[PDB]
Write an enzyme that holds these catalytic residues in place. Structure first.
Site, short mmCIF file in Angstrom:
data_model
loop_
_atom_site.label_atom_id
_atom_site.label_comp_id
_atom_site.label_asym_id
_atom_site.label_seq_id
_atom_site.Cartn_x
_atom_site.Cartn_y
_atom_site.Cartn_z
N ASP A 1 0.93 -1.12 -0.01
CA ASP A 1 -0.04 -0.11 -0.06
C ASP A 1 0.87 1.21 -0.08
OD1 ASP A 1 -2.24 -1.55 0.02
OD2 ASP A 1 -2.39 -1.80 2.06
N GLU B 1 -0.67 -0.99 -4.47
CA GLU B 1 -1.63 -0.01 -4.51
C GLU B 1 -1.10 1.32 -4.50
OE1 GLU B 1 -2.57 1.99 -1.01
OE2 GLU B 1 -4.58 1.61 -0.86
#
Ligand SMILES: [Ca+2]
Ligand SMILES: [Ca+2]
Ligand SMILES: [Mg+2]
Ligand SMILES: [Mg+2]
Ligand SMILES: [Mg+2]
Lengths: 565, 570
Positions: A211, A286
């Site tokens: 992420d 991400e």
């Protein structure tokens, strides 16, 4: 002509990937909190659903200030979800069932309660430069007023710079004050990321979702006369200096240097995969960025290779309840137009940060949206509950966990999309033996639950199962695609492959009935057979489409099976 | 199998439409100003080019404040361009050569030197409400301190409201102070637009280009408690209250009521076509707006029919030398994805309001861009000079005449606004003023590169932009281009393909490297392309000549290189 033979794809190129929100999947121990023994007890659900791979939102040791995105120990499990032993049991039982298991963490930052941060703040040798530490900007006008190193704004609002009383310097936090940005120009930080990934791969993880990658690297003060350069101002009057939007993140986001880190991670995985054999271990990245910066995660024209794929958020950012069929087509075409040759496409309708699919679109669209995800080439990403059409749950101010006042809280809270999974019509929808669930169970659990959808002749879940099964056909794993709108209301998606059956999605995404000329659909010879229909369709699986004129109700979707081309 | 017969399309569905800028096309009388006898003298050029239809920028009586877009008399010809007799000769000779002729109709506004405006300002009966006239905004802070009706901003900078001493009211001007906005809620104004169109259709015009339609209608003060409502502020700190961009034109642009006027014009024109017979008379609408507001010009979901098409400005607004092959594909797909079913697509690469095609893109992309224009389905639009790859001409501050640059700009910034560089005289040849004029004193200076870039040179030399243009217009006669399907995808960030295909007819394939670097592609990835195939057209800098056989499936394209391949039928 006999059907042509196809070369087997590596598992990650066409997997159904399911996002587990572990807190809300299955509570095994009556504390109203989902846990690893719960996930273990329901691994059979993934096989039954036709899911190939699961990833869990973060489950590492965390003070839980940002609900697990603030990781204090990257080498152990958060106690509320269980133990390292439970995690290893999950890998064993998942792998026995042929499932892949991915872990989610955030390379960008660590909890201020991590040993990394404690030691770094204390200037312990080898940790002093683990995070971004800066002196105040000299203020010779008012030397009694301390200036932050730069105007940089946190994603959470306010300064991205927090004063340490102990160290008498500022540290960088692009996210929460308790999420401290690692220095990715420190070789010891890059080594530590390899060490974390090696540790979990050695346990048996099949890969990672990583992420917040756009925020990895910020401007080097060496390039700005020994200071952190101010981000340019947006010049947008609706934002003050403490508000996200005040700056354009020229020096704090999408720096070209972050991609070199990602390519280094891919080199590390390729070498790990070569030296271990078995199933390819992957990284899915991400990052919210423009299309150019998104596609650079795959690799570059100079031949660098990065993430197996960056996640495609286009259905979250650019499609809504306002989208017509022409919008659906044009957004679907963006990934397929911009993705580098040989890239693997992926598709995402949901996650724990957004309204659930039927709430974000309409209740009558669930089947068509699940069909789009499953019938487009590449990887289908399912958010927990989409396979049964779960709706957002009502969550009161008093029941809110994602805490700003009783009148406006509902505009901010992500809790409605995180309510416990509806297994059945038992207490707490079979999520828990306890009525005291960490969030309340949605009021519609007796109408919308997995057990009911398995019992009834037509259901979202049965449609989901028929679609994951259809992905085994050569036409979906290897077929071409053609997508165009027939009207403002209805579009087609055609998967075709010489000598193999043709599959056609027809989807009325509007709130009104629509009539279309099937003669306009390429590779569709009539008669054709309904393979899947929306639960509200008059047409059942096995129904013959014989007429070139087709009326679709509001939200109605059909998958037609047609003769090979 | 014998090639299938195709039903011939109405002329306007696949015409090559050429925009003439009359002031810069051909000067016949040595005043440095292009004129109608000049156009008449070179009508043969359109036949030679393979142009089906010409649209002229305005040639009506005008003070020339906005070089003809400020019209003082909608029923006669601007004296510098010639006479009504010259216009009638132009139609006659154009029609004799099989050409269609469209006039630029400017319905939004009239010159402040029009009888309409003179009579309106004087409050003559029947003209009082011909334009948007408004009292000053009441000033309760300091009564009788004169405030404009609202914060509305002109497209040419400053307030959209001009004080009339004579009338003691403000009038609306979305464009120059001299361009006065008609009141399109006034039945007499709507009648006058039918009167103007009937007059020129009766002369034998084949239709109209409709100017500045997004600006027709503004908010009715009856819906805003008897005042003109302020437009929302953009809140962009780079714009002060007198600068275009300070407001969002919510109350001044794209009002749903404007489309009802367009649909009424189409209804009138359909009735005219029915009653008169002969070639369909058409309207093509001009409007810079978002995709939804652009597509409403074609018609609406309720079955209203508007312009035969709105111009597609995507190659002006959304593509440039900054664009890669994936950008080209994704923007080309925007019109084809959003256009209503049965709509005719069109492609515009330039006009008199924007920098020239080779300047916005690159000099080595001219052929590839003309190929896109000609090979995509529907209507190809060519702006004066694109057929020979004319570049923007240098125009000093001193030589600048464009009101937009004179109003918004100064000796340092004028280049950001000026449309003059795209209006420099056309390069016929290497004679004085590039054969535009016998005079060295031209209304705008002739571009410095006319010795290198001129039509005569391109007609003599073996390989040229113009020869490529002729080959492409000829190709549009083929059933594959008039009736074929299309497939378009990027092979890389540098190269894309466009395939036109039609069972039993030849397959045509564009391959275009839009990048500044060499690119190698696998032709095996191109649908409906069997090798060997034949080069039909190549960029002037291609190593491949028309007639070259492509036999290998590995194809290296140089920077800017485009090929049209002719391949066997599917
Ligand atoms: Ca960072
Ligand atoms: Ca107007
Ligand atoms: Mg529990
Ligand atoms: Mg003249
Ligand atoms: Mg095809």
């Amino acid at each position: 002509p006999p059907p042509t033979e196809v070369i087997q794809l590596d598992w990650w190129k066409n997997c159904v990937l399911y996002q587990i929100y572990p807190r809300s999947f299955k509570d095994s121990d009556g504390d109203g909190i989902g846990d690893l023994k719960g996930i273990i007890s329901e691994l059979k659900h993934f096989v039954d659903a036709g899911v190939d791979a699961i990833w869990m939102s973060p489950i590492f040791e965390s003070p839980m200030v940002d609900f697990g995105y603030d990781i204090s120990n990257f080498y152990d499990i958060h106690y509320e979800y269980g133990t390292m032993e439970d995690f290893e049991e999950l890998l064993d039982k998942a792998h026995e069932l042929g499932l892949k298991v991915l872990l989610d963490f955030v390379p960008n930052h660590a909890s201020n309660e991590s040993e990394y941060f404690i030691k770094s703040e204390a200037r312990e040798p080898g940790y002093e430069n683990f995070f971004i530490w800066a002196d105040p900007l000299p203020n010779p006008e008012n030397p009694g007023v301390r200036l932050p190193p730069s105007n940089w704004v946190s994603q959470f609002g306010g300064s991205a710079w927090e004063w340490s009383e102990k160290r008498q310097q500022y540290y960088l936090h692009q996210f929460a004050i308790q999420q401290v940005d690692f220095d990715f120009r420190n070789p010891a930080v890059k080594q530590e990321m390899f060490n974390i990934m090696k540790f979990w791969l050695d346990k048996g993880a099949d890969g990672f979702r990583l992420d917040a990658l756009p925020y990895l690297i910020e401007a080097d003060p060496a390039d700005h006369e020994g200071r952190y350069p101010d981000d340019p101002l947006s010049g947008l009057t609706q934002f003050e200096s403490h508000q996200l939007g005040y700056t354009i993140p020229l020096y704090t986001k999408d720096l070209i240097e972050l991609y070199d880190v990602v390519y280094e991670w891919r080199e590390f995985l390729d070498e790990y995969n070569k030296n271990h054999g078995g199933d390819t271990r992957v990284v899915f990245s991400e990052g919210y960025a423009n299309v150019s910066m998104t596609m650079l995660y795959y690799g570059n024209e100079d031949g660098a290779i990065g993430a197996h794929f960056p996640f495609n958020f286009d259905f979250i950012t650019d499609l809504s309840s306002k989208s017509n069929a022409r919008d659906f087509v044009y957004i679907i075409l963006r990934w397929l137009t911009y993705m580098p040759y040989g890239g693997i496409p992926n598709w995402v309708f949901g996650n724990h940060d957004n309204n659930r699919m039927p709430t974000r679109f309409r209740h009558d669209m669930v089947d068509g949206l699940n069909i789009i995800n499953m019938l487009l080439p590449g990887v289908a990403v399912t958010y927990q509950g989409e396979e049964i059409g779960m709706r957002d749950g009502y969550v009161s101010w008093e029941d809110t966990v994602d805490i700003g006042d009783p009148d406006t809280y509902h505009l901010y809270s992500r809790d409605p999309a995180r309510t416990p999974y509806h297994w059945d019509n038992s207490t707490s929808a079979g999520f828990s033996t306890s009525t005291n669930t960490w969030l309340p169970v949605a009021e519609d659990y007796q109408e919308i639950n997995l057990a009911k959808q398995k019992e009834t002749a037509r259901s979202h879940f049965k449609n989901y199962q028929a679609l994951t099964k259809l992905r085994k056909q050569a036409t979906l794993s290897h077929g071409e695609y053609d997508i165009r709108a027939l009207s403002d209301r209805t579009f087609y998606l055609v998967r075709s492959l010489p000598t193999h059956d043709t599959y056609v999605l027809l989807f009325n995404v509007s709130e009104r009935r629509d009539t279309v000329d099937l003669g306009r659909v390429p590779h569709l010879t009539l008669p054709a057979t309904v393979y899947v229909s929306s639960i509200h369709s008059a047409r059942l699986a096995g129904h013959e489409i014989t007429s070139s004129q087709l009326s679709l109700e509001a939200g109605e979707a059909l998958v037609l099976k047609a003769q090979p081309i």
